[PDB]
Nucleic acid binder design. Structure first.
Ligand code: NA
Ligand code: NA
Length: 327
DNA sequence: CCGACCCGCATCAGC
DNA sequence: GCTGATGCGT
DNA sequence: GTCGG
């Protein structure tokens, strides 16, 4: 439904949510607000009262009272006050740097560090992740169009295969469901020599190869099974340079790969329904394995998975395309 | 009423 | 020095 | 903040 329907309500709830996350440090409060703002974004009617809203799942008494104040007056007193509060807005603004969470934001602002400019003046006080988040502040807030993602997926699949042709790599995320744009790249990776009961360089070889060809430009973190960093498509030799982008690469045991691909493909709503259905059938699905449930509820040993379909077959479903996993 | 609401890595706190 | 807590991102 | 045992 058009954002003009309840966009004033959903912008209010999203602002309220950011302050819970970044200033209050109440992640559950943040998620209720985001939930309610989501269910209202999909409600196909211009809400006329807080009471109409309360019917919907995730909207309770406090959010029903805020919609009523917002409908009658056009604003929310408590939000208007938080917006003009110099400590709050500075803390909320600082968490937009990757690597600065609510705790570091509070400490920076507690000593006069309030802006990018102050950060640029105080690099001695930033860990490695935050220097990188500061360096690429604007680029990281930009979205990535699918044409760039296809180009980036090209480079990742080619260099992975260039390191070892038995590697299996799957760019998951909303990009695998067909999304027209993305906010980062999530690569899931496996090798037949790596299993649940099975070298600690499989990830490193692929990261190193992507660095040697100058696709990966920086590293936020890297261990034996997760790499988080920065990449960038090469310049056109005469055009503007592309903005640096975020990219994650996980190495997963081959016996849990398709469980992991299914999970990190999503959506989050689709995953819940499939987990919900799988229980009413006597199976438990998480991001690693699918296991059967005894009559008392005790899980059994994980069942063999060798594709996404294998999982669907177990729980008596017909394979759903990633395209159709919107819910 | 009142508890639930979903791990890998960098860094720090304590020993 | 090592082990465990915490912050952070996802 | 919302839900539910
Ligand atoms: Na409700
Ligand atoms: Na941040």
């Amino acid at each position: 439904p058009q954002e003009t329907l309840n966009g004033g309500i959903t912008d209010m709830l999203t602002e309220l949510a950011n302050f819970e996350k970044n200033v209050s440090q109440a992640i559950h409060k943040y998620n209720a607000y985001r939930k309610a703002a989501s269910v209202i974004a999909k409600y196909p009617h211009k809400i006329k009262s807080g009471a109409e809203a309360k019917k919907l799942p995730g909207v309770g008494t406090k959010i029903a009272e805020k919609i009523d104040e917002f409908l009658a007056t056009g604003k929310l007193r408590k939000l208007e006050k938080i917006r003009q509060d110099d400590t709050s807005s500075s803390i909320n603004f600082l968490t937009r740097v990757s690597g600065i969470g609510p705790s570091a934001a509070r400490k920076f602002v507690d000593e006069g560090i309030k802006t990018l400019e102050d950060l640029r003046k105080n690099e001695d006080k930033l860990n490695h992740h935050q220097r990188i988040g500061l360096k690429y502040f604007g680029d990281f807030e930009k979205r990535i169009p699918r044409e760039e993602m296809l180009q980036m997926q090209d480079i990742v699949l080619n260099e992975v295969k260039k390191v070892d042709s038995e590697y299996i790599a799957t760019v998951c995320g909303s990009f695998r469901r067909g999304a027209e744009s993305s906010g980062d790249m999530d690569v899931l990776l496996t090798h037949p020599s790596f299993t649940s009961e099975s070298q600690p360089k499989l990830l490193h070889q692929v990261v190193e190869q992507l660095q040697k060809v100058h696709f990966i430009t920086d590293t936020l973190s890297k261990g034996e099974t997760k790499f988080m960093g920065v990449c960038q498509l090469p310049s056109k030799n005469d055009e503007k340079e592309y903005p640096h982008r975020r990219i994650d690469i996980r190495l997963i045991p081959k016996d849990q790969y398709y469980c992991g691909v299914l999970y990190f493909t999503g959506s989050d709503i689709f995953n819940k329904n499939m987990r919900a259905h799988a229980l009413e059938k006597g199976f438990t699905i998480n991001e690693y394995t699918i296991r059967p449930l005894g009559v008392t509820g005790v899980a059994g040993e994980p069942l063999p998975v060798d594709s996404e379909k294998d999982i669907f077959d177990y729980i008596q479903w017909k394979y759903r395309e990633p395209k159709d996993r919107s819910e």
